[PDB]
Structures are given as C-alpha cells and as structure tokens.
Design a protein around this ligand. Structure first.
Ligand SMILES: O=c1ccn([C@@H]2O[C@H](COP(=O)(O)OP(=O)(O)O)[C@@H](O)[C@H]2O)c(=O)[nH]1
Ligand SMILES: [Mn+2]
Ligand SMILES: [Mn+2]
Length: 526
C-alpha cells in the first residue's frame, strides 16, 4: 500500500493493473457558463470537481500553534467517521473519503461508514451501474456502505450510521469536504478527558465556483435567532462576554450555545443517553438547535476546536436535493418544546404556524425530558447564552402594532420583513404584517417576522446591528426617539420623518401593545 505522510491509509483507488479505478475529467470547457453549470451541479461546479484529483492536497488552515501539540495515537480511543449522502456526486463524495483516509492515522480510525440515504443516482443505486460499490472494492476494508431503502433525511441517515458504528466515539462529516491535518486527534483527546463533551471542528470553505480553499472567518461561538436558526455572535454580543473570553487563544477549546452544521464528534454511549436525535424530525432543518438546547439542558457540553479544521463546499446558485416545504416548520415546532415559555416568542416570529408536528410523539419527548431532569430554557439563556439580546421575556416589553391615533394608522412593513425597503402607514388590520417588537437591550424596533431587520430614522428597514445606528427609546409619552439624534418619529402627512421631540404633538405619539406572555407555552392543536 505504501503509506506515509499525506497517504496515511496507503495508496487509494488503485486497480490490480496499477492504474486508477477513477477516470478523471478533462479541464472544464473554456466557454462554460457558471450560472448554468452551478445549476446542473447541485450547487457546485461539477466540471471542475470532476477534473480535480481525488487526492487533492489542501493548505493547512490551522494556526501555527496547533502544530506544536503532540498526540499519543496509542492512548487515544478509536472513532468511526460517518458520511451520509443523498445523491452526492462521485467526485465530491470520493474526494471526501480520500481526504479522510489520507489524513487520518489508521490507529485511531476504526471504520468509515457511508450511508446512502435512498439515493436515486445511477452511480449509487443498487440496480444502477455499480460504479460506487465497485470503486469501494479498491479502498481499505474499513470503508463500509449501508443504505436506507427510502430517503429518511438528515436525522434518519445520521442515526443509521451512528447505530452501525462500532467505535466508542463517532464523528459525523459531510459528503463534500476536505480535512486539514490532525483534524481528529484534538477531538478524541478532548472527548477522552470527559465523555459528556460534544466537540465540533471549525469549518473552512471551498468555493463552489473555483474550488479554491478559503479560510473560515466564523468565530467559535454561536447564538440563535428567534426565527430558530443559528447565528454567530455579533460584535456587541462578544463584548458582553467575560473579559478573559472575548479573544481566546487559537488553541483554547471554546464553548458554544449552539451548533451550526452537523460536523461534530461525540461519545456514542453519551450521545444515546442525552437523547441522540429526535427521530420524528422531518428531512432537513433545525435538528442542530434541538440537539444544542437538549445537550446543554441535559448535562452535556458543546465545544468547538479551532485546531480541528475541515473544509466544506458551501453550495451556491443551486441546491443538491429536495425537501417538503412543511418539514422545516415541523422541525421548528418540535424544537420549541425545549424553549419552555420562550416558545411563545419563537412561535410568533415564524408566523404562528399550525402544522402536524407529531404531537403524540412530542409528549413522549416531554416525558423523557422530565424523566431525565433536564434544565429549563431560562437556565439555558442565563448560563449558556447570557450574551443574547433576550435573556428573559422582560427583554421584549412590546409586541404588537405601532399605531398613531392622530392619523388612525399603524406601521406596515408593506409585504417584506426582509430589510432594505421602506416602512409605510396603513389602516390597522391586525395581521402579522403590522406587528413589531422591541428588544430593550439594543433599542431595536423590528418586524415580528424577522429579528434581523431594524427600523431606521430614514423610515426604512435595514439589517440589525448592535450599534447606536439602530438604538431607539420608547418614551413614557409614546414617542419613538432615536437616541443618537434625540429626534422623534412623526407620522405627519402619512409620511415618516424625524422631528424635534414634543409630547404635545399628537403626530409623534404612538401606542405599542405591551408583551405579557404566559409562564407556559401550550402548543397549538392539530
Ligand atoms: O435527505 C438528506 C439530506 C442530506 N443528506 C446529506 O447530509 C449532509 C448534510 O446535508 P447538507 O449538505 O444539505 O447540509 P449543509 O449544506 O446545510 O451543510 C450532506 O452530506 C447531504 O448529502 C442526506 O444524507 N439526506
Ligand atoms: Mn454540507
Ligand atoms: Mn448578526
């Protein structure tokens, strides 16, 4: 096999006749149209990917201080790397397998499980052309293939691989990645010291159009938006950390309230004891936040390892597969179980949806939660994510329409909660399009359906930032006063203009519904 640096599992993909079992493509056509190629490639430039080598060398994205560390590969526990895919192309999938095997010591790699989540591509189908399974015969025995007869989704595919894993630790990677050196050693050492740790590698990027390796700029810490999606700590949220954590060492392991992707390593025994995944989550979306919340509340710890780095092809100009439109909403309702009274806020932000969130199985998760002794979401916000803009629902004093009695009209986002457009004044009708909320920790006036969009003195919505350019004070007289200018907002003449503050001018007096949610969120009925 001839192993060594850069080929830790030997020379991969060689036939009996010493020639490669993968015929690689010529250089992409010179007249290629990137927008049309990105579409056909499910988000990546497939002409270029098929032309690149499966044994790609990648730059070492780690800080130089990560190379000064030593790992005794005989004391570390073995791990099972799990890659699940639905119609991932051959070149990107096999490049991932090659990267793992080339860059992972065999002492610490028990196996590499490939989970076909009901792929329909000919090169993967069991009734197909057999290209994949035939090429696997040219790879180490560690590489196994297991299939789901029907496509189950992220959670269904992940659980299949985890259940099939024989090692005490498993590591979940995507089917379109490349690793930096010594990516697994940091994870194993950290999980070895404490089995309750779920350790995430930090993600670098591979451009979808050019396939250049790109340094990841994402920090370690991740919060969440009330739209129920993870979000990196903003500058003003980092500023709220203890001084010793605002700028930690490149080598320090850092906790994170939330997980972004599904790239993490965990002790298999602990993973099942902490609830694994909720196997009634549908297809794609939000399982990372449900796991993040449950993990912390249930005794676990979520950490990121800046010295463990993996490259990831972020899609662009296309998508790799389909997903029902309601699967994302169901996954969000089920995640609200772990948010306790805060679910009322999240429920109003995503439009008060009424869907079949499998209530019968959700009550059983409610019982598992009480039987396990998991902690409240209040504890979560106060201890794991106290840097957020909303630690208690007291931090959202107002939620409802912003009405002006003089002209008899309320604020209206006019159809787009997405920022960049002007706000208007219209006859009040009570729909969510006229509902705004106030985050007092930052003075933000936002539409309830998008906590990333903030009112500005210009009368428009723009991307929220934790700065004085978006700070408002709602006075005891009902005025909307921009703090930087000390001017107040007026609805005079049906247009929105800033004017000298005067509590005697009725055109600048607003009413805003106080927000007094219940101590208990009761789910909507199906
Ligand atoms: O029904 C599905 C959807 C996705 N995946 C795989 O799960 C991983 C994560 O999906 P995706 O790449 O969409 O995640 P993201 O782009 O958000 O990181 C990928 O290897 C997908 O091919 C899968 O096995 N089954
Ligand atoms: Mn991915
Ligand atoms: Mn932000």
């Amino acid at each position: 096999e001839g192993a060594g640096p850069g080929r830790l599992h030997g020379r991969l993909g060689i036939k009996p006749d010493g020639q490669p079992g993968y015929t690689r493509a010529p250089s992409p056509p010179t007249d290629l149209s990137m927008p049309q190629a990105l579409a056909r490639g499910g988000g990546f430039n497939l002409y270029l990917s098929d032309h690149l080598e499966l044994d790609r060398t990648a730059p070492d994205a780690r800080h130089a201080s990560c190379r000064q560390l030593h790992y005794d590969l005989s004391t570390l526990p073995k791990a099972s790397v799990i890659i699940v895919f639905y119609n991932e192309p051959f070149s990107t999938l096999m490049r991932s397998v090659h990267s793992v095997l080339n860059g992972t010591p065999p002492q610490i790699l028990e196996e590499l499980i490939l989970v076909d989540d009901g792929s329909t591509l000919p090169y993967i189908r069991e009734d197909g052309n057999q290209q994949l399974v035939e090429y696997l015969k040219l790879l180490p025995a560690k590489v196994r293939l297991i299939r789901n007869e029907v496509r189950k989704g992220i959670v269904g595919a992940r659980m299949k691989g985890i259940r099939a894993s024989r090692a005490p630790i498993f590591a979940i990677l995507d089917s379109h990645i490349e690793v930096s050196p010594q990516w697994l050693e940091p994870l194993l050492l950290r999980i070895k010291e404490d089995s309750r740790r779920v350790v995430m590698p930090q993600i670098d990027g591979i451009d979808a159009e050019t396939f250049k390796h790109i340094a990841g700029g994402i920090g370690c810490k991740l919060g969440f938006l009330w739209k129920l999606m993870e979000h990196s700590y903003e500058g003003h949220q980092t500023a709220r950390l203890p001084p010793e954590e605002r700028q930690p060492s490149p080598t320090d392991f850092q906790t994170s309230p939330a997980m972004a992707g599904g790239l993490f390593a965990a002790n298999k025994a602990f993973f099942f004891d902490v609830g694994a995944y909720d196997e009634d989550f549908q297809f794609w979306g939000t399982e990372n936040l449900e796991l993040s919340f449950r993990l912390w509340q249930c005794g676990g710890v979520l950490e990121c390892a800046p010295c463990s780095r993996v490259y990831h092809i972020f899609r662009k100009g296309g998508s790799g597969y389909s997903s029902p439109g309601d699967s994302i909403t169901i996954n969000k309702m089920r995640t609200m179980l772990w948010m306790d009274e805060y679910a009322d806020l999240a429920w109003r932000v995503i439009g008060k949806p009424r869907v079949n969130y499998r209530p019968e199985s959700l009550e059983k998760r409610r019982e598992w939660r009480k039987r396990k002794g998991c902690k409240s979401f209040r504890w979560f916000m106060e201890n794991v994510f106290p840097e957020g803009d909303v630690v208690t629902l007291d931090d959202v004093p107002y939620l409802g329409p912003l009405r002006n009695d003089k002209i008899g009209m309320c604020l209206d986002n006019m159809g787009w909660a997405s920022p960049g457009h002007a706000v208007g004044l219209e006859y009040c009708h009570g729909g969510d399009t006229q509902t705004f909320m106030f985050f007092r920790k930052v003075g933000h006036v936002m539409p309830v359906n998008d906590d990333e969009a903030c009112l500005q003195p210009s009368g428009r919505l723009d991307w929220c930032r934790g700065t004085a350019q978006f700070w408002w004070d709602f006075t005891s007289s009902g005025q909307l006063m921009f703090r930087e200018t000390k001017q107040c907002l007026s609805a005079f003449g049906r247009k929105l203009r800033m004017v000298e503050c005067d509590d005697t001018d009725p055109y600048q007096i607003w009413s805003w519904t106080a927000y007094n949610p219940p101590d208990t969120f009761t789910f909507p009925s199906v």
